Design a protein around this ligand. Structure first.
Ligand SMILES: CCCCCCCCCCCCCCCCCCCC(=O)O[C@H](COC(=O)CCCCCCCCCCCCCC)COP(=O)(O)OCCN
Ligand SMILES: CC(=O)O[C@H]1C[C@@]2(C)[C@@H](C[C@@H](O)[C@H]3[C@@]4(C)CC[C@@H](O)[C@@H](C)[C@@H]4CC[C@@]32C)/C1=C(\CCC=C(C)C)C(=O)O
Ligand SMILES: CCCCCCCCCCCCO[C@@H]1O[C@H](CO)[C@@H](O[C@H]2O[C@H](CO)[C@@H](O)[C@H](O)[C@H]2O)[C@H](O)[C@H]1O
Ligand SMILES: CCCCCCCCCCCCO[C@@H]1O[C@H](CO)[C@@H](O[C@H]2O[C@H](CO)[C@@H](O)[C@H](O)[C@H]2O)[C@H](O)[C@H]1O
Ligand SMILES: CCCCCCCCCC[N+](C)(C)[O-]
Ligand SMILES: CCCCCCCCCC
Lengths: 155, 1034, 144, 96, 48, 48, 48, 48
């Protein structure tokens, strides 16, 4: 739609004022781009905490996935946006969500080595024994990355 | 010296002839162009990495080259782009005065030593080191009308049969093909390759083996066996020539016996090198040639030669192929020359009319008709010697000089005619006295006018180069005019003019000329009686002077300033920008709608629309395009409503309706390298390896801050492209080693298929051309197609790409900028209405200082030159003043009297500002030089009035008021004759509506309006200025 | 003698030799310079706080200073009193032998896994009719 | 190396020659391609032309052609020098 | 160790180096400082 | 004047059947009949 | 060779005009120059 | 221009003798140069 495109750009940029207006005007919160990213995906990726909260309040799909099956929790967990990861999980984000590769937010958070997020994901009941298409756990990544602190948390 | 040539009229005639011959010779040989070289020397390093993304190109090519641009002479700054098309451009801009050849070879040499550090594929494609030049002489479009040929089919014919001949044409400096010559395209089928257990690696291996030049040797080569009879060259395998031969390339032989060939696993055709651009001319497929003008060549002759060459190529053209001329500057340059020669002739015709109106004899009217052409020709000889070319700036530079050239002729003759009338002296002795009265002033005037115009040339940067063209042109013209006035015209006046009886002012004649003499003689008495009353109450005119000075200063500040006025060139641009991530097809639909509008609703105005899909000045990609609109003849489009600006603004309003596209039209600037006055060019640098995202945020922080000052800064925007979605595909190393698949085979299969791979050369009809292996369209479109590509493992089994790969979406730059070997982000913008650039820049510097730690800034392009060369303006103005004062001080032998002359400046300027502000023109170069010629002539008039008045007080021991009234009486007629002639002479330029009118309007209006005040005011005011000054200091 | 032309004539001849030189000598980059043998000035760089080592200071000077000074007009040559950082792989022969490996395998592996690949584009030109997706493909990149 | 005149002319001579358009003070350009594989494109310039500047202008224009040439030709090398056709002297050497 | 290019002006080149170093100082890490332990231009400037 | 040329034609399909690489063929012909520049050596303190 | 011959007429033409104008200026006359310059053919025939 | 009255001599291997023989030739020259303090002073090689 007309406003759908302006929300995607506004959600990406981080313009809180423009989002508020578009939420009032009635912009589609499930409006995807070409790759299949909702405004929540954009806000989750670029780390805009308020817009993530604003979109979720406006009945935005928290478990919306792209053409490759990656959710906003994947993008938030991978790029180390601790604050956003918590908000998504509270609004009912699937912590064991698998993309087309079988990669969960735990795998991504482990690979970039975001210690604080790994604990939060585990706290909300993340499957630590979860494997990707190559049969790799979050622990398998930590020992291959050589992250001693991360490996100890996964024990 | 006048006395020397009054007794020696033949010596003067010899000098006249020598000058005329030298000038005549110069006009024949002088180069002809639209505009000369103005922008500083720049060297553009360009390369291509087929299939490579922005980052890949940057971190493999751009950074490596940038690091090895060390020990080069007179380098100012170095900018670079690295885009997702696989292209890189590094523009090294040099100091104004640097040898562009030395600058190029120094860059080209330091690159050669960095070539071994670049990737194999980039070394293979090559790196081009060229001198920057956007100024095309003309673009020759080549189109197919019967739809038998594609754009690639046309491009090949142009490359083979036309380009080489157009290159060898007399006066052509460089030629640029719009499109590529044929390439052997192998469109691979992944389902077929997997069926026979093959890969792109095998296809590349097979092509390199079976399409190659093999060395053999000779029969009976030295050292031979003594008694050898025959010595012949052994010819082995050579390069393939046809698609059929590439089809019969053997890949594999099966056990059963049946053979696997390249045609069995791929489609083969003679295609283009790349498919990024889709060129169209009113819907029909199109290519073309970008022709540039050689150094010191003639644009008119070069154009005629190109057309004459294209003409004799037409008989060999295939059925459907036609030549079109969407862009051509020589039509404009033809009119520029004709209109100037028409003005210079009409000027001398009007002098004849004015000379005869007042003096009333044909022996007087000839002397200016002789003297002026002698100077005009002489000027060409001096400019030819200085190495100048016939261009718009030097042409109009002489039109502006007409005022000074016409005066020097009139002043000398009138003064002789006056002395003969008042004293009844014979022509020869009357000329000796006449020249005796003015010779001192004319030598003074030369040094004064020199002091005005010479400093104008000493300006730096692009703007300073334009001023230099007007400066040397006017100084040269004026210099010879004074020289001719002291050599030729005295001799002519002494010989040609007949005697006049003492007291005979032609009041005793009949008819029109009888009435005019009594009319003027009593008008002269009204004028002297008038000045008489003015010189009793001088106080109120010093008040009226301050009203003019405040009037001037007011209008000066509240007149919009520019570099050059926009012209109707017969063409204009129309940008088409779609949302980022859009496809080539989407952009074509918009360009089709844009092309439709112009050929439908603007059918009366528009001739053709060159729809270039894929091209964008501020970044390439599928989601950008340009429509090059070509209009019909200037005569066929009557009224302002059917001119470019009117069509431009109508089109912009129409295309604002278009759904998902930023579409708008804009007229082309006179010179592209300047940009816009009020506009600035700001570079935001990464000074501590912060990365891309951290510089993106810092840019967004500055753009947000700049937006919160609309009163100072407007249209503040990034020049670059925004981050776009990209398909990240991690190759699992363990899974690849486990199945026995090498990383070379994986990265080659992906790179060759999806990106393309330049394998080697082949010879199509005796021309070396490229061979590209790539995936057929339908197997390299969507992420699902990744899994359909199979790589062979060491064990022999075929492994799909899915088995050892994982993919996800991320955001990355499709065009990474750098400035002085550091990551940069160019930000454009302009000063708000009323504000100067200096104010706008000073705020941008303040906002920049409150950005995160590690983020620096710098000024580039027009802003870099404005920061440095702009500061010279007052220091030259100062030097000019001191020299002018010194020159007048020497002339009059008085520190005080010079002031009387220097007070005349505003009288000429006020009129120019009225005419400009009234009409709605700008403070442009044509107007600004237009002032200096109006100031120069008003000063010249005053210098004579003050000299005459002074000489009467010194020699004949007259009173101040007596001498002043006597002086202004004698100088009344020649001032009116010069003005009447010049104002009528420049009148056509003011009312001009047709081609190149914008410049004529700027030149004409700023002179006519200024001359009206300069004449009307100075005749009353210079008397006042002299009296007040002479009283104050004596 | 025109030093600018002297450089051009000398390099013209060096370009004929460059191919005949080893692959290793070319990849270190041959330089043709026209400078006075004696030093104009020495620009010393130190850390007063003692936060950075001799090797750290040298790296910064090479990475964030040297290039711009070398590009400056009149600067014939710039000698770095130090060395720019480089990813050092300090090999252990006892450990290479244990896993049946050599320096060759280490060099081969680095060349394969530390590589910046040209992987093309999705919906790249020439595309199919009715394509809506266009995005650059990113395979392996350089290691940081 | 190991190329015939026909092949050399198509792949090298014509490629270089068609990049030698628009050079300051060029009178004429003679060239030859032989069966040994050699090319020799001699550009004669106007009388009084700065020979060193001429050389630079040619070198610059050649390096646009350089990458379009075959791989073998680039590895062998290409020179751009000021050339006279006749010998000042021949200095013979014999063994008595 | 900066060496003067063939036929270039020592003082003018030295001035340009200081202008380039002056643009780098603001973006230095905490503690880093420029020192001038050798320079031939100060003599040429003062001696004249 | 135009000279005669000895045009030898290598059958790559027939070579593959016998199990010989066309690289070895090209090198064997090229080296033998034309001569091949392998590398350099030192003849009395000079590279040749 | 052809260049030398093609410019020879232009060379004689201007050379005559210059010598004529040079004499015209020096002796302040048109008769003296024209009276002298009629001698040129008497010399040229001797050379031929 | 160099030091007041210093000289820069080059000893050349004109007939491709080798390094060792050029070293011995140099040692012979330095030996004979050493035993003329009245004429020559501090004569030494610049190399290692
Ligand atoms: C490749 C090149 C292309 C071709 C270009 C061609 C260039 C041609 C240049 C040569 C032009 C020469 C023209 C000569 C004109 C002579 C006219 C009079 C001749 C004559 O003998 O009469 C004299 C009196 O004439 C008088 O009345 C003398 C008074 C002053 C006369 C001035 C007016 C003449 C105008 C000449 C210029 C016109 C041509 C412009 C190009 C007597 O002689 P005398 O010795 O008794 O004189 C006394 C002085 N003491
Ligand atoms: C410093 C500077 O910009 O000098 C310029 C500008 C200039 C100083 C002018 C000389 C003189 O009128 C000046 C006076 C005091 C003249 C009287 C008033 O009208 C003043 C409002 C005016 C201010 C500027 C002006 C107009 C200059 C000259 C001298 C040129 C003189 C002649 C005869 C053409 C110059 O440019 O050389
Ligand atoms: C820098 C000097 C300052 C300006 C001095 C005065 C400028 C005005 C005079 C310019 C006239 C001389 O310029 C001369 O114009 C004539 C026009 O017939 C041109 O003559 C040309 O006409 C047409 C134009 O397309 C061609 O097809 C043809 O081949 C040729 O005869 C010359 O190629 C040009 O050199
Ligand atoms: C339309 C605006 C553009 C025009 C710009 C030119 C302005 C000058 C206009 C012409 C002025 C001449 O007009 C002249 O004015 C002066 C006043 O100063 C008059 O002078 C008269 O009044 C003054 C003041 O009371 C007396 O000292 C004087 O004795 C008396 O003759 C003249 O009688 C008249 O002839
Ligand atoms: C340096 C400025 C030149 C000003 C011109 C001076 C000319 C004065 C002539 C005086 N005169 C000799 C005619 O009596
Ligand atoms: C095409 C004309 C070029 C002119 C070169 C310089 C002329 C000098 C004349 C003395």
């Amino acid at each position: 739609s007309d406003l759908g495109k302006k929300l995607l750009e506004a959600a990406r940029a981080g313009r809180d004022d423009e989002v508020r207006i578009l939420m009032a005007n009635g912009a589609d919160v499930n409006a995807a781009d070409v790759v299949g990213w909702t405004p929540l995906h954009l806000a989750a990726y670029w780390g805009h905490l308020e817009i993530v909260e604003v979109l979720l309040k406006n009945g935005a799909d928290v478990n919306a996935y792209d053409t490759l099956g990656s959710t906003p929790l994947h993008l938030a967990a991978h790029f180390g946006h601790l604050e956003i990861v918590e908000v998504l999980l509270k609004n009912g984000a699937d912590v064991n969500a698998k993309d087309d590769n079988g990669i969960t937010p735990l795998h991504l958070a482990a690979n970039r080595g975001h210690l604080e997020i790994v604990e939060v994901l585990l706290k909300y009941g993340a499957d630590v024994n979860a494997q990707d298409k190559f049969g790799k756990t979050a622990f398998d990544i930590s020992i291959n990355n050589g992250n001693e602190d991360l490996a100890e948390i996964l024990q | 010296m006048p006395n020397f040539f009054i007794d020696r009229p033949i010596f003067a005639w010899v000098i006249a002839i020598i000058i005329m011959l030298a000038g005549g010779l110069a006009i024949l040989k002088l180069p002809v162009a639209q505009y000369p070289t103005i922008a500083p020397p720049a060297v553009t390093i360009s390369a291509s990495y087929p299939g490579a993304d922005a980052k890949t190109v940057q971190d493999t090519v751009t950074q490596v080259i940038e690091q090895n641009m060390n020990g080069i002479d007179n380098l100012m700054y170095m900018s670079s782009n690295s885009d997702s098309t696989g292209t890189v451009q590094i523009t090294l801009t040099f100091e104004s005065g640097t040898d562009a050849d030395i600058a190029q070879v120094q860059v080209q040499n330091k690159l050669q030593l960095a070539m071994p550090l670049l990737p194999q594929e980039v070394q293979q494609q090559g790196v081009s080191v060229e001198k920057s030049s956007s100024s095309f002489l003309m673009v020759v479009g080549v189109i197919n009308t019967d739809g038998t040929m594609t754009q690639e089919d046309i491009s090949d014919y142009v490359a083979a049969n036309m380009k080489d001949a157009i290159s060898r044409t007399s006066g052509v400096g460089d030629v640029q093909l719009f499109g590529s010559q044929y390439a052997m395209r192998i469109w691979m089928n992944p389902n077929e390759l997997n069926k026979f257990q093959l890969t792109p690696v095998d296809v590349i291996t097979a092509i390199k083996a079976q399409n190659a030049q093999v060395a053999a040797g000779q029969l009976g080569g030295t050292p031979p066996v003594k008694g050898q009879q025959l010595n012949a060259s052994i010819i082995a395998q050579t390069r393939l020539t046809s698609t059929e031969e590439f089809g019969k390339i053997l890949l594999k032989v099966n056990q059963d016996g049946s053979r696997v060939l390249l045609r069995d696993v791929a489609k083969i055709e003679l295609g283009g090198e790349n498919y990024d651009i889709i060129a169209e001319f009113n819907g029909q497929p199109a290519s073309g040639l970008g022709i540039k003008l050689a150094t010191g060549a003639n644009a008119l002759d070069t154009a005629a030669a190109i057309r004459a060459e294209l003409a004799k190529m037409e008989p060999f053209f295939p059925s459907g192929l036609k030549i079109v001329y969407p862009y051509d500057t020589t039509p404009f340059v033809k009119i520029s020359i004709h209109e100037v020669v028409k003005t210079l002739v009409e000027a001398i015709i009007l002098v004849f009319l004015v000379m005869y109106l007042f003096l009333q004899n044909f022996r007087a009217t000839l002397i200016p008709t002789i003297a002026v052409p002698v100077v005009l020709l002489g000027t060409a000889a001096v400019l030819a010697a200085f190495g100048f070319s016939i261009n718009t700036l030097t042409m109009f530079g002489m039109v502006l000089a007409i005022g000074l050239l016409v005066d020097d002729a009139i002043v000398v003759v009138e003064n002789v005619e006056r002395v003969m009338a008042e004293e009844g002296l014979p022509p020869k002795e009357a000329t000796r006295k006449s020249m005796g009265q003015i010779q001192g002033a004319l030598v003074g005037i030369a040094m004064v006018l020199s002091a005005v115009f010479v400093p104008m040339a000493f300006f730096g940067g692009s703007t300073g180069a334009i001023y230099r063209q007007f400066s040397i042109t006017i100084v040269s013209a004026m210099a010879l005019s004074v020289l001719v006035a002291l050599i030729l015209t005295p001799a002519l006046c002494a010989t040609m003019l007949k005697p006049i009886a003492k007291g005979d002012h032609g009041e005793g004649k009949k008819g029109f000329f009888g009435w005019f003499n009594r009319m003027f003689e009593k008008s002269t008495h009204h004028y002297t009686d008038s000045v008489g009353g003015i010189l009793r109450s001088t106080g109120r005119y010093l008040v009226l002077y301050l009203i003019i000075v405040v009037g001037m200063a007011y209008l000066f500040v509240r007149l919009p300033s520019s570099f050059l006025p926009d012209e109707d060139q017969g063409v204009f641009m129309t940008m088409v920008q779609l949302p980022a991530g859009a496809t080539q097809e989407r952009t074509q639909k918009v360009l089709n709608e844009v092309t439709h509008y112009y050929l439908t609703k603007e059918k009366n105005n528009v001739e053709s629309v060159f729809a270039v899909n894929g091209f964008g000045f501020a970044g390439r990609g599928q989601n950008t395009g340009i429509a090059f609109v070509s209009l019909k003849d200037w005569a066929d489009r009557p009224g302002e409503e059917n001119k470019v600006e009117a069509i431009t603004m109508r089109a912009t309003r129409a295309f604002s309706q278009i759904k998902d596209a930023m579409v708008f039209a804009f007229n082309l600037p006179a010179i592209v390298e300047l940009g816009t006055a009020t506009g600035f060019d700001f570079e935001l640098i990464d000074q501590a390896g912060l990365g891309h995202e951290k510089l993106t945020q810092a840019r967004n922080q500055l753009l947000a801050e700049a937006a919160k000052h609309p009163d100072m800064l407007t249209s503040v925007r990034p020049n670059g492209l925004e981050d776009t979605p990209q398909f990240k595909i991690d190759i699992d190393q363990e899974k690849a080693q486990a199945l026995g698949v090498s990383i070379n085979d994986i990265n080659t299969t992906l790179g060759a298929a999806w990106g393309g791979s330049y394998v080697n050369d082949f010879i199509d009809r005796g021309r070396v051309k490229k061979v590209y292996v790539m995936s057929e369209a339908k197997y390299r479109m969507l992420p699902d197609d990744i899994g359909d590509w199979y790589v062979r493992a060491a064990d022999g089994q075929m492994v799909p790409f899915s088995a050892f790969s994982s993919s996800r979406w991320e955001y990355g730059s499709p065009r990474l900028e750098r400035y002085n070997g550091l990551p940069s982000m160019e930000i454009l913008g302009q000063a708000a209405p009323g504000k100067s650039t200096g104010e706008a820049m000073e705020l941008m510097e303040q906002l920049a200082s409150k950005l995160p730690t590690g983020v620096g800034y710098d000024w580039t392009g027009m802003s870099y030159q404005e920061r440095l060369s702009g500061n010279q303006a007052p220091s030259l103005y100062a030097i000019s003043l001191i020299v002018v004062f010194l020159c007048l001080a020497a002339l009059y032998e008085s520190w005080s009297i010079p002031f009387s002359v220097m007070l005349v400046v505003p009288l000429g300027v006020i009129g120019a500002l009225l005419a400009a502000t009234f009409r709605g023109l700008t403070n442009d170069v044509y107007f600004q030089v237009g002032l200096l010629t109006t100031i120069g002539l008003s000063a010249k008039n005053a210098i004579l009035i003050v000299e005459f008045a002074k000489d009467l007080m010194d020699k004949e021991g007259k009173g101040l008021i007596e001498a002043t009234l006597d002086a202004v009486r004698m100088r009344l007629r020649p001032i009116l004759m010069t003005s009447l002639a010049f104002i009528l002479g420049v009148m056509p330029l003011v009312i001009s509506t047709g081609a190149g009118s914008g410049a004529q309007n700027a030149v004409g209006t700023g002179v006519m309006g200024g001359m009206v005040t300069a004449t009307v005011l100075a005749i009353f005011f210079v008397p006042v200025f002299f009296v007040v000054v002479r009283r104050r200091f004596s």
